[PDB]
Amino acid sequence: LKVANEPILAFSQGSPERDALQKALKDLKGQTEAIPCVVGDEEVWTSDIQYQLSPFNHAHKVAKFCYADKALLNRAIDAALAARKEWDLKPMADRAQVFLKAADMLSGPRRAEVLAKTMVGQGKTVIQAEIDAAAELIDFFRFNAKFAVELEGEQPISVPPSTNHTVYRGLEGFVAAISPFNFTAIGGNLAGAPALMGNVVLWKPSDTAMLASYAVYRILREAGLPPNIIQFVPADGPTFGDTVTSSEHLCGINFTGSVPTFKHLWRQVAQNLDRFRTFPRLAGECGGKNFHFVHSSADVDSVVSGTLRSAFEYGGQKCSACSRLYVPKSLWPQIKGRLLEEHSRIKVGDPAEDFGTFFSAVIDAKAFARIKKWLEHARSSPSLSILAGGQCNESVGYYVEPCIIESKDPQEPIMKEEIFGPVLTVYVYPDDKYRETLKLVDSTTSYGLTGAVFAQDKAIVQEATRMLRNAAGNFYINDKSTGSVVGQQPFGGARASGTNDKPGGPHYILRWTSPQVIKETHKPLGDWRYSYMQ
Amino acid sequence: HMLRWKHTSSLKVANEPILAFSQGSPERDALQKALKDLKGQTEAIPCVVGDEEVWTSDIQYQLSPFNHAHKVAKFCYADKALLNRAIDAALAARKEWDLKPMADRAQVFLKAADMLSGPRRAEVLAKTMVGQGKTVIQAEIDAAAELIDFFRFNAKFAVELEGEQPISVPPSTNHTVYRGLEGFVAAISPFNFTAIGGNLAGAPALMGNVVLWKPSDTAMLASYAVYRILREAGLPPNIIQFVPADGPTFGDTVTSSEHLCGINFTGSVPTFKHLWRQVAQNLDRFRTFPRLAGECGGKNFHFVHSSADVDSVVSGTLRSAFEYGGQKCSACSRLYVPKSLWPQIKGRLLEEHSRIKVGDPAEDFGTFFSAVIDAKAFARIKKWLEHARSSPSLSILAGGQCNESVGYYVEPCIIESKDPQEPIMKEEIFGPVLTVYVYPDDKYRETLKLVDSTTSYGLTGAVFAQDKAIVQEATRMLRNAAGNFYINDKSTGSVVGQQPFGGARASGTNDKPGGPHYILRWTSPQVIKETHKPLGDWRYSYMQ
């Protein structure tokens, strides 16, 4: 199966895509969608009513949904389990066709819709929605389809008089998919990739991405996904976790989110290990405290633009966002001056009404409060100085200005802890301490997700690459630490950053299949004795 | 381009040929000599950390299963201090080993494979026969063929994996580095296959990991032989630490280290679950999330349809149930037979049964299988034989005796159950004990469901049938009852590269050692993107 990456559109004035997106945005203005839980084809409402708010205008309730209770979740499990055998017995190609059709729909007639719902519901600007809800999701669907179809061609050796064949079975049981607010595409992949491999899934989408998540769900159903293969089950986090880890039929958890939550689920599975019919597979992509490391030979313009984008795009709400910048003293006057000047030109505002907006409000009240706590810490710490930004205002939306901080302490808590907000901390190191500082990049935090080195000196790049081998699972030379592209930079890292199953690459789907090998022998067997025994 | 990437190589390997050991053959003469080399000998096997041979006070003996007066090895359990010293030294060796080209790491295993194939073949076979109680052919498919195949095929899979690279588009170049896991891996191997110990420790090492290998007490002699061959083949010090130990003690120590990054386990389900829980308990101490791999037991079936070839059923079932005393994770322990064929099959099984020779595999090559592994195994099997006599649902059709005066000798035993849910149909015995359930022909479908639902396991199984429609139906119905499924062949004897081995349900994590994907559990890939042009502005054109 031949596939290539979905083009990223330019959205120039008067372009078809810009016109379509403007209309789709208008289609959502003032609208609230009532989004039910979906079990099979049944739309189910509980009394546990919840609302998703537009981050940049929280008066706008973009969706009303509800939390599935334990009983509803248990029903969803039973219904899914009953549909699994037939789905798993379907040829891989037939299952792939659903995702390829969904991809075509997202590429064309549904593009504007999913972009708009991601913009209005999650607070993304045009381009951030485009690389996510369109390109990345489309790529996940097309590339995983290719990988899965080609996996069936990975067959063992047959020697006469026997024929051997590997059957890539889905896992027996159900998979729980738990997706984060920050990428529409990640939800699609967490539920979609296991389903592609013959699994059935309870999908708990993020509250704060409900609108776009349901849009993806409906597209999958319209593209031909049968009932009870993916159940759409928003729920209270703990309740969902407690329920799925209590079922003897749990066979996997596909998680993206916080370290402590993933650890909790892992421990719940371990506590209940004697109840399960098989050993559940846990996949978890968690956060990072990602670096941009600058050598004195760096191209300053690239450092500045790459760092502004990595640190501040989508309000810094990326697992891969740069939050610690290491700069040699010799380059600091240039980089400081340029960062502060460009900072003053960044527009924070309504991304639907003003396409000039660089980034918008953070996701919700809780994120706003957490980020404010870090800004307050930056105003308190003896080693920290806010160079620019630091303002926030939640009267209309959850607006946090981009903030640039200098730390005199390379080990300050702000250098170690993931904020998930538009907060960049800079540490200036003496040029003659480059090596010691590279070691600090590696040793300071608990994370291992992304990092970049900016340098134009080959020996330096080779040395830094070797030294930072385990400091970053996605490592960048002269580029920003965010924006991995499916099939080009498979994404993930180790240390505390998760299990590193590399979604976006060819091996990810292997976590969602439990292979069976069939040997058929075409001639009757001989005696049980062996010739040497005579 | 500041980073330059090498062309990846390819590797041509094929399965190691099984030798015939005919009279007057060089391999038979060599094996006889190697067996004589062991007669009356006790090897003192130390712990090895780096290149240092270390002894502790916890002295242990390995006995020859068929002559337990013969202590084939004296070894010792590493204490917690020594295990922690081994961890420290392995960790200090890891970065250099991980940075070695995959092809250089592969060379060690290819050299070891050649040594095992040729000059060391008789040695590892003899040590497996004498120490684990295997017959010639069981040792051959194991200590030679399978171990050699693991080393060669995994080397091929690993070298070729580096050719799996992502797409690059201007202005950037993307490359995947297949890093070893950061930390150490604990490998915990079982008594029943010499080859499994080699794979459990060796596969992670091949992928740039460092390993503490706790071999099975009852396979110490052969295991140390493999370890020595690896070192001789060029494995550097501190890459695989040879550390026999008390099982609980070993598990407590490795799961208490912040640097644990994997456990590669084959053995009992309860032990695997215990380790899994210990890792979960210590989750907050680890630098990264440890990867647990576990292959555990089965309760494997041969299912017979009325259309089956009777002779194939009988011979395949006798081998599956009784070879190596049924001490295989894949051994047939439940036989389902249709009433129409039971008179023929029963007659044949009983006749052939009476011809099975149990005895000393070193002294008498006529031996079909020998003693079970140890006193513990003997005791357990004895209790099951007693259960068969006591249970009103069970009847012993053949065998049923045992004698531990010289070796742990158990006759092959065939039992009929009238109850398809009898405990003996559910619980793994790991002994030469076959249970048969006879079902009415017209209930074959209902009976297929019973095959699927009766046990907690999903490892191996076979269907014997000449009807295509039936084979297709059974194959669909039994999809999750067996990770290795056989049509008209016995349920044991998977061959590397041909039948990748493993199963789910209670039988383990099913990572399919023997196949091309197993090595992926032991690498944590990094992707490097190098961009070759300056970046532009931070703004985008649509924002204008």
Swiss-Prot record, chain B:
* Xref: InterPro entries: Ald_DH/histidinol_DH (IPR016161), Ald_DH_C (IPR016163), Ald_DH_CS_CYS (IPR016160), Ald_DH_CS_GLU (IPR029510), Ald_DH_N (IPR016162), Aldehyde_DH_dom (IPR015590), P5CDH/ALDH4A1 (IPR005931)
Q: Which residues carry this modification: Phosphoserine?
A: 25
Q: Which reaction does it catalyse?
A: L-glutamate 5-semialdehyde + NAD(+) + H2O = L-glutamate + NADH + 2 H(+)
Q: Which residues bind substrate?
A: 494
What Enzyme Commission number(s) appear in the record? Answer: 1.2.1.88
Post-translationally, this protein is described as follows, namely:
Acetylation of Lys-80, Lys-95 and Lys-383 is observed in liver mitochondria from fasted mice but not from fed mice.
> Whom does it interact with, and what assembly results?
Homodimer.
The protein's role, per its UniProt record: Irreversible conversion of delta-1-pyrroline-5-carboxylate (P5C), derived either from proline or ornithine, to glutamate. This is a necessary step in the pathway interconnecting the urea and tricarboxylic acid cycles. The preferred substrate is glutamic gamma-semialdehyde, other substrates include succinic, glutaric and adipic semialdehydes.
Name by which UniProt lists this protein = Delta-1-pyrroline-5-carboxylate dehydrogenase, mitochondrial
Whichever gene encodes this chain, its name is Aldh4a1
